[PDB]
Design a protein around this ligand. Structure first.
Ligand code: HEM
Length: 151
């Protein structure tokens, strides 16, 4: 569980992401694709992009990153009480996009990577631990929803 204090560490650094949602989204997606090229291959809409220059030039990829971080921001602001936000996400990702649960672990690592790179002053050991726990709770609730939907 996170304490209220730990939720504040999470929402404090998230307010730094919210200063530049689009730029953070691009850095996280590019990090994910570089770390785990199987993830890009699974994105029919984006799999054409072959290089980092092409990825940073894609307005579609940029708008997608904004959707992702907007949805995740709304989830984190619920401080674990995200059942309602998770339902449509689990539904689309299990049954429509067919995203393997492991990919949610990979994007969590990519989020930690970018937060650390851009906000080290707001991402000390306690803030890193709090964000890891918040994303782990998210991933595990999605995993349980995946299984409930038969995926
Ligand atoms: C924090 C984790 C995630 C959040 C909050 C998130 C959120 C979203 C949202 C809000 C959309 C548009 C609405 C919808 O279809 O549900 C979406 C679409 C999609 N997402 Fe995720 N998502 C994440 C994890 C992933 C991962 C790990 C991948 C890697 C393949 C992924 C790829 C998919 C794809 C392929 C679409 C459709 C994009 C398109 O072609 O328009 N997402 N996501």
């Amino acid at each position: 569980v996170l304490s209220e204090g730990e939720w504040q560490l999470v929402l404090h650094v998230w307010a730094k992401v919210e200063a530049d949602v689009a730029g953070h989204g691009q850095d996280i997606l590019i990090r994910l694709f570089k770390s785990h090229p199987e993830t890009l291959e699974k994105y029919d809409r984006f799999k054409h992009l072959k290089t980092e220059a092409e990825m940073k030039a894609s307005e579609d990829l940029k708008k997608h990153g904004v959707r992702v971080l907007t949805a995740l921001g709304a989830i984190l602001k619920k401080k674990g009480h995200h059942e309602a936000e998770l339902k449509p996400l689990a539904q689309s990702h299990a049954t429509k996009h067919k995203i393997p649960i492991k990919y949610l672990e990979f994007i969590s690592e990519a989020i930690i990577h970018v937060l650390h790179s851009r906000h080290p002053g707001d991402f000390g050991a306690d803030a890193q631990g709090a964000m890891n726990k918040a994303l782990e709770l998210f991933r595990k609730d999605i995993a349980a929803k995946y299984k409930e939907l038969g995926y």
